[PDB]
Write a protein that binds this ligand. Sequence first.
Ligand SMILES: Nc1ncnc2c1ncn2[C@@H]1O[C@H](COP(=O)(O)OP(=O)(O)NP(=O)(O)O)[C@@H](O)[C@H]1O
Ligand SMILES: Nc1ncnc2c1ncn2[C@@H]1O[C@H](COP(=O)(O)OP(=O)(O)NP(=O)(O)O)[C@@H](O)[C@H]1O
Ligand SMILES: O=c1ccn([C@@H]2O[C@H](COP(=O)(O)OP(=O)(O)O)[C@@H](O)[C@H]2O)c(=O)[nH]1
Ligand SMILES: O=c1ccn([C@@H]2O[C@H](COP(=O)(O)OP(=O)(O)O)[C@@H](O)[C@H]2O)c(=O)[nH]1
Ligand SMILES: [Mg+2]
Ligand SMILES: [Mg+2]
Lengths: 651, 651
Amino acid sequence: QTTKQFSKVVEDLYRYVNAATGKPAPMISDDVYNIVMENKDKLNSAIVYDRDFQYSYFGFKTLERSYLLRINGQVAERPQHLIMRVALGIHGRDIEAALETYNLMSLKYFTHASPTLFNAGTPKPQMSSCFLVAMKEDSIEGIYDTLKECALISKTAGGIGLHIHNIRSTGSYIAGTNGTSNGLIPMIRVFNNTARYVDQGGNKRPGAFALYLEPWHADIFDFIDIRKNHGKEEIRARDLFPALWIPDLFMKRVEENGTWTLFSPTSAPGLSDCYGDEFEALYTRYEKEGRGKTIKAQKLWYSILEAQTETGTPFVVYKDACNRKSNQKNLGVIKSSNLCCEIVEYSAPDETAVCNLASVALPAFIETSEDGKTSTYNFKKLHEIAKVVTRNLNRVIDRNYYPVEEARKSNMRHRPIALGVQGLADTFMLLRLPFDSEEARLLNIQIFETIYHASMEASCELAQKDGPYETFQGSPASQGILQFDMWDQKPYGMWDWDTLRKDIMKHGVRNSLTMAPMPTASTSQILGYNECFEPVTSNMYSFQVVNPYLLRDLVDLGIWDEGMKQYLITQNGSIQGLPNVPQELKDLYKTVWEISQKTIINMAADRSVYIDQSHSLNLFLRAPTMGKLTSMHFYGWKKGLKTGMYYLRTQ
Amino acid sequence: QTTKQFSKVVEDLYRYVNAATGKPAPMISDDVYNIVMENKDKLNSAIVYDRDFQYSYFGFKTLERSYLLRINGQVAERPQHLIMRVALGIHGRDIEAALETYNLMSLKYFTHASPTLFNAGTPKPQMSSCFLVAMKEDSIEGIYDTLKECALISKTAGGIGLHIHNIRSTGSYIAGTNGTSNGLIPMIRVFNNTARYVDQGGNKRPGAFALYLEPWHADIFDFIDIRKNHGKEEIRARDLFPALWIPDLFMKRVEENGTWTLFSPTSAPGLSDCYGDEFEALYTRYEKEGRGKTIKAQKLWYSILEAQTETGTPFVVYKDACNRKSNQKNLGVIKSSNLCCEIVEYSAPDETAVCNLASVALPAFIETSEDGKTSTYNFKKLHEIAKVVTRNLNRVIDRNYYPVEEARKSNMRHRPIALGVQGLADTFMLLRLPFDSEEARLLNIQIFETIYHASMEASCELAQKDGPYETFQGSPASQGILQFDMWDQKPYGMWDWDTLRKDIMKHGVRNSLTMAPMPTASTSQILGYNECFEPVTSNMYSFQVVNPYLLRDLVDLGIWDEGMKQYLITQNGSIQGLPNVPQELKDLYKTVWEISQKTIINMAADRSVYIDQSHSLNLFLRAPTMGKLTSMHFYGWKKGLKTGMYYLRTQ
Ligand SMILES: Nc1ncnc2c1ncn2[C@@H]1O[C@H](COP(=O)(O)OP(=O)(O)NP(=O)(O)O)[C@@H](O)[C@H]1O
Ligand SMILES: Nc1ncnc2c1ncn2[C@@H]1O[C@H](COP(=O)(O)OP(=O)(O)NP(=O)(O)O)[C@@H](O)[C@H]1O
Ligand SMILES: O=c1ccn([C@@H]2O[C@H](COP(=O)(O)OP(=O)(O)O)[C@@H](O)[C@H]2O)c(=O)[nH]1
Ligand SMILES: O=c1ccn([C@@H]2O[C@H](COP(=O)(O)OP(=O)(O)O)[C@@H](O)[C@H]2O)c(=O)[nH]1
Ligand SMILES: [Mg+2]
Ligand SMILES: [Mg+2]
């Protein structure tokens, strides 16, 4: 019920015409069509259609539902065809690299983020997932230009993070009239409205932008409350996500139980265009000068926590930790993260930051291969594959179709890239390692060091062929200061950092950033592994499937029965305090709510030194409480995390 | 409790500084300040402060509430100061014309529309009331550019009429995705949202745009329903006004009880860029070609009437009558009217049409001066004053501050102007003429002929000094075809049209259009006369004042008492079927609901031949019914009215 020969499938796709309209609607690009036809034999015979049986029933139905291209609502592309198309879309004329990417992706070593999977090798190749946008100016012209931009971006795949620190707060003065300003909320309501009007890619799910405000902005209280399902209606913005861009001085005032001061950006200019001490200097001076409204820090705090407890938002991202520890610091002051709090990239009115994403599948490197029946981890294959994905994401930068000029400007200047991971929890389980074990802690550090090292090396090789990126000179990287150096730490040492730093100083790197582990929400589901780097949330998930690693074990112990089936549904996928189940299994299959959030922050802190950018650290709290949240926020803060919190997931 | 010397008042205004902010906020322009100081003696001694006692208690409190400039919430300008400032803002260095305009305005011969009163002689002189905007393109870029434009326009005084015939309808195809379009409504919802976010001038009342669609657009049914207070919520747009831009062919299909066909503009291009026969030719061809959805004309009809009955909207404006009979026809096809259905001016993506407005006060020309105690009408003073206002509106064009480039382009090319009137009903009453009398019918024709003639002559003189307007060549006017010629009628003849046409053909006119009688909602209330050209809606209005002409008469007849007071409140200001009241009085003070709508359309049809543009014809129906509305719509249509209906006012 789908044509088999690949080039025949391309033919159809490429020759498509929309019957309702009589318009030719080719779904393959010219340049990719040509490549395919010019190499039809090599390409056709390289595919291995058994590999379609690598996908779980749920894995495949995800692919089927919205990934594999359709001709008149009918799926016309086999999973292998999707992959082959992707590999071509990325690799163009370089058939060898294409062919390499094909095998590895089909073998499920890694995958590319959804935009790539959707649009690679199609005429409008928009393979980018992230856009961080700057509010252009505190004017009606600036506001509507940015609005126009978000709409144009939203037309295609990819989420937006938008920062709005420069917008005049409620009641602020306006030259030329006696009218006074209305603040962020009415304006937020405009963005929200545009988010709902512009389809993403052309389908069901709404626009969703994330909004970045620094907690001193005079409209903060309402801003943080944007997602509440009560109060009024016209004070909310229920399709957007508030994200706090928090400076240390705030955390400090909260801790010391002191005061916080709210400014309108026009009474207190420059607050967001600096960080660390210069910021505190400037902020304290403005406070002295009575340009704002002072209140007790802990009153803002307490509000911030109420919102997180109810909505899981705002997210928290530490402005200082982000700017102090960015390889982009030479470009200027970074003003926001993105929609999923993983990207940390400079943006300006004329530079909208972009990022391409792929995820290495960590389980694929477990080989129970030595002799007996221990497993090891093949960190050599991890390095190799990590290098390939680096090269891929880099190719994507050039072949990408940018939705707006400020995106193309930004990407061609700095070439940031984003690697991350899926199936950490799987690797751990397969390796008989409890998520909170000293062994798992070692493995985390190790996996991440090796990806960072790999991608930095592969990027170094690139710089050697195509020159460093335009803005390499002046970077921490160009001075020998890599990610972990900015954490005042020594790398674990599994790889040779001296030689790499040596080369990097000599030849540069092609990419300003490389690592930003992301949520993997849908691309982990295709491959059949757990979300990114978080532990399982349940052993039962939901049409209800028992954890295959758990299940396997329950059988070998001849204890899997009806009570064991139904207990898992009762106890929502938890095996703790369950009568006939060994301590080994109990430790290994703790749900995420059963692991200390201190351990999570620890391992997050551990891998963070090999992360160029940030990672989407979700927090999970079972029995939620002000004080409990407070110690999780501050704990992470002091660890020097960038993304202190993505969602607060609860119940 | 307000400084008296005028130049002192300017001084304060001009020297103002906003204390909260420490910013200098001058409220007079540089060039006007200089003029004032350079002529302080002439200017100070020309004012006559008794004239402040020309204003009724309600008249003055309107002026006080939002017209006279304030210094720290405290009124600092006397009505005479407002006027003097206006006359200067219009007339600049020409002190004689300034001084002329001052006397006439203070004497209440005429006034300028509210934007003028608000901003003349201030630093951001935006004295324009009307903007007709073109939807830039059926793209997300075009949509958001227009949105940006409406916002920038809304920043200052003046209402918008926006036409959207070129936007792709629900479910229409989009190249580049499998997504399908969502039609006008979601997009309308975006405009609506911007209308509420951008304050007008800087105060309370919401943005309000009027939206112009041709009834064949495939989204018509929902479009016409935009103002209903039920159904759903997300299908409505309750801060905008739908206006039908109706072609004859529709009226015809409705009458002949035939079919109507709905097209998306992309399946049926060019429909709005033509009119009359070429349109019917093109439309019928598209129908034959099955590019649309056909339904029974009378089903659309019946829906259109349900909406008017409930919401008083959509307005009706006949596209063909507008284009066939416009002096702007040489410019291209006019695609919309404005917010109050009086302006009929060409617009394009790069030309947003503008208009300045003043209203002659018709009562001021009644002089009971011959000998005995008949009154006459001084049509010679009407001609004179009408000429002055022409010159004024023309000066305003040059001294105006345009909110966007497409407005400045449009106005400097064609220089349209807009005269109208207030206190028709007053003139009639003062002259002992029932609104529906053959005498009142004669006076209407007469008043309007004389304003048209006057303004055309005064504009001719201008063309002689400053050249014709850029696009005069090719105009009906340049061929000797004036307004009434396009109605295939001969003018009443009270003035010498041969000589004027002769001169116009020779020298041109400065303005492409001159006459567009408007609602006068607030500027008739300042002067203390009834709205524009409509009859009184009540003799009692509302803190309740009895019609002074009625009241006067009731006293001289010694019949005004308690029963007469309270009867008027009971019968909502109607004197019909009331026991001790002469037939003379009953005929003279019919409320508007007591006058045949056929008579209204007649007199509207009568003055329409001296109207360059259109006029805001409100319809009043007491006992509303499908068939009754139907005969009022068709009656007006056949009379060749442009604005068939502004609001349907009911109850
Ligand atoms: N009519 C209006 N309605 C609502 N908000 C407005 C309006 N005018 C300005 N603002 C807000 O005020 C800020 C300044 O807008 P902008 O258009 O730059 O003002 P401006 O007229 O140039 N005056 P200023 O910026 O004070 O010199 C922006 O954040 C706008 O959102
Ligand atoms: N992602 C989207 N969501 C909602 N409406 C859209 C989207 N993309 C396009 N439209 C509508 O489709 C029409 C065409 O938009 P435009 O941006 O010109 O499309 P395009 O991508 O250039 N394709 P086309 O115009 O069909 O050649 C406009 O009326 C838009 O309102
Ligand atoms: O629902 C979503 C999820 C994600 N993203 C974007 O994709 C990035 C990572 O998303 P994720 O890994 O969850 O999606 P995947 O690539 O696996 O499909 C984010 O930073 C967003 O910019 C988005 O636009 N909508
Ligand atoms: O509430 C209003 C009424 C009017 N207008 C604009 O002003 C013109 C005429 O308005 P009107 O005569 O009623 O107002 P006035 O000039 O008397 O204050 C219309 O065509 C609109 O463009 C507006 O923006 N808001
Ligand atoms: Mg400004
Ligand atoms: Mg287009």
